[PDB]
Symmetry: C2
Subunit: 383 residues, 2 copies
């Protein structure tokens, strides 16, 4: 019966929104990021009962916290690790069950990005509010003091923002008109501004291959964008080849990934040390650090150039999301796959070793012989 609408991966956890107004989560539970009230890891997708009936329309993971929002309810919810104010409730308290971010009540939300310890929300009118750690200017407020509550980014006054993205300690955004911005911790060139200097307010990227940009995403210390013509650009850290240019060189400005130049990129995701890109014809390409199999190409060797991730019967991919050591994807057939590190249960396939090529999550998928059952949190996850 239930379709997977949205998937998101955090550092060691995974969250999905399903049709029928249901959120589920699995993986590491130690900081409360799963939202079930307890602190235990969940190796199988588990219904987040506190959100039943809340008409949630989106979920987004940060490293060790989760955010979700309801259009109808006019509410944004957060839970997980609370340090530095990343949950936005005016304190640093962890939450093991979702609580509304009261400052955002009644605000019409378009999109939310979560990094390691900061978050941002774009409104329907293209305004941006940010909160959390700000030691390197990543909130975009023009200082270096953390904020425990959402703050309007005054620098974007009179500019319609389309989407935001957030890494460990940096932030990026694209406007509706195609401009690309970067701010925060900039030491690995990850802002795309041609230097290694932090920025306390958003600064526009001027080296964009002459192109307007339609989307952006952040990995831990790297950044990915897609241009109006569907070309893919990466910048920042490439120690593990996560920039995908066939070498291990950092780039301080956006650098077009030439190997994918004949494809039109439709979705992008940045992991800890790896990267995913989805083409308009449904082909998924992964690259970067592959120690735990998170690139999904059937080995544990790092990949400094894009390699297509393969699925049964070559079924097309429609969604992808990178965690720190795992990756999740949804296919056209409404199957959900996961691969990579499995030690916290983040793959959602029950108790399992790590996987280096895509494995179907039976509880969430049409196929797999059984489209099994998401579990109640009252089930003991160690049993």
């Amino acid at each position: 019966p239930r379709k997977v609408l949205i998937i998101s991966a955090g550092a060691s956890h995974s969250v999905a929104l399903l049709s029928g107004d249901i959120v589920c989560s699995w993986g590491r539970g130690e900081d409360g990021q799963l939202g079930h009230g307890d602190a235990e890891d969940r190796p199988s997708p588990t219904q987040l009962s506190a959100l039943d009936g809340h008409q949630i329309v989106s979920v987004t993971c940060g490293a060790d916290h989760t955010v979700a929002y309801s259009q109808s309810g006019m509410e944004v919810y957060s839970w997980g690790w609370g340090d530095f104010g990343r949950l936005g409730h005016g304190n640093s308290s962890d939450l093991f069950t979702p609580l509304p971010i009261k400052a955002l009540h009644g605000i019409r939300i378009k999109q939310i990005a979560c990094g390691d310890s900061h978050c941002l929300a774009v409104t329907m009118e293209g305004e941006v509010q940010s909160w959390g750690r700000n030691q390197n200017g990543q909130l975009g407020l023009g200082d270096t003091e953390d904020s425990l509550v959402p703050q309007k980014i005054q620098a974007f006054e009179g500019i319609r923002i389309k989407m935001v993205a957030a890494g460990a300690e940096h932030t990026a955004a694209v406007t509706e008109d195609g401009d690309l911005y970067g701010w925060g911790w900039g030491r690995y060139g990850n802002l795309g501004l041609g230097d290694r200097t932090d920025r306390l307010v958003p600064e526009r990227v001027t080296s964009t291959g002459g192109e307007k940009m339609s989307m952006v995403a952040c990995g831990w210390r790297h950044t990915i964008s897609v241009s109006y013509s569907g070309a893919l650009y990466t910048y920042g850290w490439s120690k593990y080849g996560q920039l995908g240019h066939g070498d291990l060189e950092d780039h301080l400005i956006p650098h077009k990934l030439e190997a994918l130049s004949n494809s039109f990129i439709s979705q992008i995701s940045g992991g800890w040390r790896h990267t995913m890109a989805l083409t308009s014809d449904g082909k998924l390409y992964g690259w970067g650090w592959n120690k735990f199999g998170q690139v999904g190409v059937g080995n544990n060797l790092d990949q400094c150039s894009p390699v297509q991730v393969r699925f049964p019967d070559d079924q097309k991919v429609v969604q992808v999301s990178c965690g720190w050591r795992h990756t999740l994807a949804v296919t056209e057939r409404n199957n959900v796959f996961a691969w990579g590190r499995g030690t916290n249960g983040q793959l959602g396939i029950g108790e399992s070793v790590d996987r280096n090529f895509p494995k179907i999550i039976e509880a969430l998928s049409v196929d797999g012989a059984s489209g099994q059952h998401i579990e109640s949190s009252n089930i003991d996850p160690s049993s």
Copy 2:
């Protein structure tokens, strides 16, 4: 029949040095912090074979990395999560097996402290070198750029340092003559300097009532010191009551813990959000965040004043080390106990739920025994 000489706890792992100069480790293995060459958690104490025969005399855990040194070998080793240069090898590579910090070769080491992502070593001549993340000045080098290799702290020229300590992003030290210093991230008052501002070089804590400090330790965002008279001082963050003053107030300068004024504190340790102090007569007191039972008092309720941790037959405690969510201790009977969060195997008692009061580690104890395991064993 092997005595446990030193215990040290990291965020989610545990390391010990045994007689015969044997190193063992257990708990979270994902970042290489156990040093066995694989990435798997170890729920039981496991011999770190790469250090067999290296005559290691000390081990020290950071959050997700570990350091050790040999006097005879004149060598310092590090392994685990490599980002920001915390391992000190001139790169950002993680290490799943110990490698020597070549910059420290041939230097006589007195003590090493490890924080979240920076480390410091004190030499036998009282000089200090630091390395790792420096975004908030925690290296004490006068800037905010990370260092992938050890660097001398010039600010201490002419000052003989006795011991150092490191938290998440801050650092503290005491001199041989009892002066106390702090530097790095200072937003919760944890530097002890009377404000909430960072420092980029070491600065002396001038408000100690003229009292000299024999030792200092750091928790994640709090700091603990002991005077030459054995008085316990805490400062910094007390959101979880980890300063132990019977309330939840931060303190910007060192503050005497009045409730223990009749005891002489011999050892101290700071955890993520909890604290341990050991008296000269072997009584262990814990306080702070207790969600996972890490305070060791038989429940899961936070404690904002010291409570004595009880052991079987009231056996005296001789060593204690706080992790992020667990605690380790060694007793007079050569028994080793662990308590708190157990999900990564950090308690070392085999696969286990969390524990809220001390549980014996059979592999390392007299009361006590199974044995330490080879890394070849399947931990699953």
